[PDB]
Write an enzyme that holds these catalytic residues in place. Structure first.
Site, PDB file in Angstrom:
ATOM      1  N   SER A  22       3.930 -46.769 -26.996  1.00 14.30           N
ATOM      2  CA  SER A  22       3.239 -45.579 -27.461  1.00 14.30           C
ATOM      3  C   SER A  22       4.131 -44.772 -28.385  1.00 14.30           C
ATOM      4  O   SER A  22       5.330 -44.671 -28.161  1.00 14.30           O
ATOM      5  CB  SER A  22       2.775 -44.731 -26.288  1.00 14.30           C
ATOM      6  N   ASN A  72       5.984 -41.008 -26.676  1.00 18.36           N
ATOM      7  CA  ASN A  72       6.179 -41.031 -25.255  1.00 18.36           C
ATOM      8  C   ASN A  72       7.651 -41.261 -25.038  1.00 18.36           C
ATOM      9  O   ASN A  72       8.224 -42.198 -25.588  1.00 18.36           O
ATOM     10  CB  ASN A  72       5.341 -42.152 -24.655  1.00 18.36           C
ATOM     11  N   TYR A 114      -8.796 -41.273 -30.114  1.00 14.54           N
ATOM     12  CA  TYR A 114      -7.654 -42.103 -29.835  1.00 14.54           C
ATOM     13  C   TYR A 114      -7.930 -43.066 -28.682  1.00 14.54           C
ATOM     14  O   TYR A 114      -7.677 -44.273 -28.791  1.00 14.54           O
ATOM     15  CB  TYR A 114      -6.479 -41.195 -29.508  1.00 14.54           C
ATOM     16  N   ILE A 134     -10.934 -43.982 -27.383  1.00 14.57           N
ATOM     17  CA  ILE A 134     -11.997 -44.910 -27.754  1.00 14.57           C
ATOM     18  C   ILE A 134     -11.503 -46.066 -28.632  1.00 14.57           C
ATOM     19  O   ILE A 134     -11.952 -47.209 -28.486  1.00 14.57           O
ATOM     20  CB  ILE A 134     -13.140 -44.158 -28.467  1.00 14.57           C
ATOM     21  N   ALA A 135     -10.570 -45.769 -29.530  1.00 12.37           N
ATOM     22  CA  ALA A 135     -10.032 -46.773 -30.434  1.00 12.37           C
ATOM     23  C   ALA A 135      -9.146 -47.802 -29.721  1.00 12.37           C
ATOM     24  O   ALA A 135      -9.189 -48.991 -30.048  1.00 12.37           O
ATOM     25  CB  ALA A 135      -9.272 -46.110 -31.581  1.00 12.37           C
ATOM     26  N   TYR A 175       2.203 -51.979 -19.250  1.00 12.33           N
ATOM     27  CA  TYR A 175       2.468 -50.581 -19.515  1.00 12.33           C
ATOM     28  C   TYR A 175       3.010 -49.880 -18.259  1.00 12.33           C
ATOM     29  O   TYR A 175       2.867 -50.372 -17.135  1.00 12.33           O
ATOM     30  CB  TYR A 175       1.193 -49.912 -20.034  1.00 12.33           C
ATOM     31  N   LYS A 213      -6.075 -45.263 -14.461  1.00 14.21           N
ATOM     32  CA  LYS A 213      -7.098 -44.798 -13.521  1.00 14.21           C
ATOM     33  C   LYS A 213      -8.480 -45.314 -13.901  1.00 14.21           C
ATOM     34  O   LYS A 213      -9.190 -45.888 -13.080  1.00 14.21           O
ATOM     35  CB  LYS A 213      -7.112 -43.267 -13.447  1.00 14.21           C
ATOM     36  N   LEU A 214      -8.846 -45.106 -15.156  1.00 16.00           N
ATOM     37  CA  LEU A 214     -10.099 -45.604 -15.686  1.00 16.00           C
ATOM     38  C   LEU A 214     -10.273 -47.098 -15.411  1.00 16.00           C
ATOM     39  O   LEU A 214     -11.387 -47.581 -15.177  1.00 16.00           O
ATOM     40  CB  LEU A 214     -10.144 -45.329 -17.181  1.00 16.00           C
TER      41      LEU A 214
HETATM   42  O1  LIG Z   1      -3.308 -42.252 -21.072  1.00 18.33           O
HETATM   43  S1  LIG Z   1      -2.272 -43.280 -20.886  1.00 18.33           S
HETATM   44  O2  LIG Z   1      -0.935 -42.675 -21.213  1.00 18.33           O
HETATM   45  O3  LIG Z   1      -2.279 -43.778 -19.444  1.00 18.33           O
HETATM   46  C1  LIG Z   1      -2.640 -44.617 -22.044  1.00 18.33           C
HETATM   47  C2  LIG Z   1      -2.854 -44.248 -23.457  1.00 18.33           C
HETATM   48  O4  LIG Z   1      -3.693 -43.382 -23.756  1.00 18.33           O
HETATM   49  C3  LIG Z   1      -2.033 -44.923 -24.557  1.00 18.33           C
HETATM   50  N1  LIG Z   1      -1.120 -45.909 -24.115  1.00 18.33           N
HETATM   51  C4  LIG Z   1      -0.643 -46.814 -25.201  1.00 18.33           C
HETATM   52  C5  LIG Z   1      -1.032 -46.313 -26.550  1.00 18.33           C
HETATM   53  C6  LIG Z   1      -0.478 -47.189 -27.623  1.00 18.33           C
HETATM   54  C7  LIG Z   1      -0.726 -48.654 -27.400  1.00 18.33           C
HETATM   55  C8  LIG Z   1      -0.558 -49.141 -25.989  1.00 18.33           C
HETATM   56  C9  LIG Z   1      -1.129 -48.207 -24.976  1.00 18.33           C
END
Ligand SMILES: O=S(=O)(O)CC(O)CNC1CCCCC1
Length: 213
Positions: free
Chosen positions: A25, A28, A159, A161-162, A183, A188-189
């Protein structure tokens, strides 16, 4: 690295070790250069094939919702994503992997498989209040990586949805037989999708693999 999977099905894919899609990400703190190397080293050791998923252009939405003007947000993302890419390329070279198997979730905007999955996620988002709420929350968790207002979330959720097609059917998009999206946060989803709570389905050849050091 440790691992935890959603269902017994995600577990069966895990035992075959065919392919892992390592999420990175853009914004992060988890993803230091150093952590990226250790994460990638582990993936190449554990799996037959390794690919990498970076954020698409919609990551600009997360910054805009947070107040950043459009033009600057787009450049900030380009900077961060191209940086994630450079570290991941370096790491893949060093461990025998494949530096070209790094994708962003925007790279397939015109691909049939990806567009079809977008449609499914979008349909559910507009038709199903419970799925829409779930998405908003997931977009809120994306921002956290000031009060988060309703409207910030409607911007940010583009973001979510994509990216979601890669969470439910990355193999359709990448052309590999089966995969685990890997990851460090829990999904949760993903649990609710597991229990058939929405019109969106998790493909039987996709899994979610939570990693921790
Ligand atoms: O909401 S979370 O942090 O659990 C997950 C989220 O929205 C994004 N996580 C990354 C984004 C970039 C590519 C791989 C996944």
């Amino acid at each position: 690295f440790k691992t935890e999977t959603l269902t017994q099905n995600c577990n069966e894919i895990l035992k075959r070790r065919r392919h892992v899609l390592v999420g990175i990400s853009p914004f992060n703190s988890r993803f230091s250069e150093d952590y990226i190397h250790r994460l990638i080293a582990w993936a190449v050791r554990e799996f037959q094939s390794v690919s990498v998923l970076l954020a698409g252009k919609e990551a600009a939405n997360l910054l805009e919702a947070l107040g950043t003007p459009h033009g600057k947000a787009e450049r900030k993302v380009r900077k961060e994503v191209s940086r994630n890419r450079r570290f991941a390329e370096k790491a893949l070279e060093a461990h025998g992997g494949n530096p070209e198997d790094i994708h962003t979730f925007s790279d397939f905007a015109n691909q049939t498989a990806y567009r079809n999955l977008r449609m499914e996620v979008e349909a559910a988002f507009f038709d199903q209040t419970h799925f829409r709420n779930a998405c908003l929350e997931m977009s809120h968790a994306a921002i956290l990586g000031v009060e988060v207002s309703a409207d910030m979330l409607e911007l940010a959720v583009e973001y979510v949805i994509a990216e979601l097609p890669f969470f439910i059917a990355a193999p359709d998009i990448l052309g590999v037989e089966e995969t685990l999206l890997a990851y460090h946060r829990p999904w949760k989803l993903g649990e609710q999708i597991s229990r058939n709570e929405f019109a969106v389905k998790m493909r039987p050849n996709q899994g979610y693999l939570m990693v921790s050091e």
